[PDB]
Amino acid sequence: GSELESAMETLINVFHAHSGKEGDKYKLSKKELKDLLQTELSGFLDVQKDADAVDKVMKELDENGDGEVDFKEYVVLVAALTVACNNFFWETS
Amino acid sequence: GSELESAMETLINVFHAHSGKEGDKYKLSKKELKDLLQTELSGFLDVQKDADAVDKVMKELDENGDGEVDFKEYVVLVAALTVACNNFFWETS
Amino acid sequence: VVACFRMTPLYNLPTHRACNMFLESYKASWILTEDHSFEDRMIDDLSK
Ligand SMILES: [Ca+2]
Ligand SMILES: [Ca+2]
Ligand SMILES: [Ca+2]
Ligand SMILES: [Ca+2]
Numbered sequence: 001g002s003e004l005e006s007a008m009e010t011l012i013n014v015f016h017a018h019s020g021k022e023g024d025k026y027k028l029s030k031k032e033l034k035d036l037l038q039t040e041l042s043g044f045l046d047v048q049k050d051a052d053a054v055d056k057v058m059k060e061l062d063e064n065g066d067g068e069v070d071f072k073e074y075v076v077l078v079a080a081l082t083v084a085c086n087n088f089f090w091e092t093s
Numbered sequence: 094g095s096e097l098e099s100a101m102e103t104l105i106n107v108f109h110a111h112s113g114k115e116g117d118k119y120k121l122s123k124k125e126l127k128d129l130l131q132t133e134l135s136g137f138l139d140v141q142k143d144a145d146a147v148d149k150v151m152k153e154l155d156e157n158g159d160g161e162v163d164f165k166e167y168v169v170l171v172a173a174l175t176v177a178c179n180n181f182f183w184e185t186s
Numbered sequence: 187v188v189a190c191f192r193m194t195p196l197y198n199l200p201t202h203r204a205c206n207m208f209l210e211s212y213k214a215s216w217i218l219t220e221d222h223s224f225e226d227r228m229i230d231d232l233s234k
Contacts, residue, residue, distance in 0.1 A: 002136070005134060010097070014097050026183070041097075041098065061188075077188065080168075080169075083165050084187040086164055
């Protein structure tokens with residue numbers, strides 16, 4: 001019915017809440033994104049070791065060259081991470 | 094957080110549901126895709142109401158031209174649009 | 187995985203920009219490496 005809408009609105013709540021507390025209320029700055037990911041995923045992320053890796057991934061993820069991660073870009077990347085997790089599921093054997 | 098993880102999990106659940114609904118292995122035929130769409134997003138989305146849109150979306154989703162959709166394509170584009178809707182809502186409407 | 191999601195592909199690049207860099211690369215490797223020794227011939231011919 002509206003379960004994908006539920007998932008999408010949960011996504012919105014989470015990343016907006018993680019943006020606001022740390023920086024500009026809406027978009028995803030570098031520090032916002034770093035703490036956000038820390039909040040988001042544990043036991044799977046390899047970016048935890050270095051925040052400079054977060055910085056450079058932010059630099060790429062900001063092909064627009066503004067230093068702030070757009071919502072569309074972030075959602076497409078986390079969709080690629082869904083891709084990676086499904087690949088993980090298949091790799092399991 | 095783990096809630097966002099569960100959001101990806103919900104995406105995967107809904108995908109595999111209609112990938113096997115018509116038995117299309119793990120990939121959405123035109124019919125599976127249509128039924129999927131009007132199931133997950135009742136309202137803002139239209140497939141039955143807009144069959145020409147369904148056909149154009151068949152071509153656009155299937156840039157490869159296979160006519161079937163795997164996880165990467167729709168996750169990217171559908172996530173982008175469905176999240177950007179509310180971003181526009183906040184911005185202006 | 188995010189290290190490669192960028193993927194910065196060459197095949198998507200516009201033709202003119204790709205050609206402009208191809209000329210640079212070709213000049214840098216092939217033409218520059220190519221070795222021609224004409225000094226001896228030129229000096230002998232001029233001296234004669
Ligand atoms: Ca922000
Ligand atoms: Ca950006
Ligand atoms: Ca299928
Ligand atoms: Ca396709």
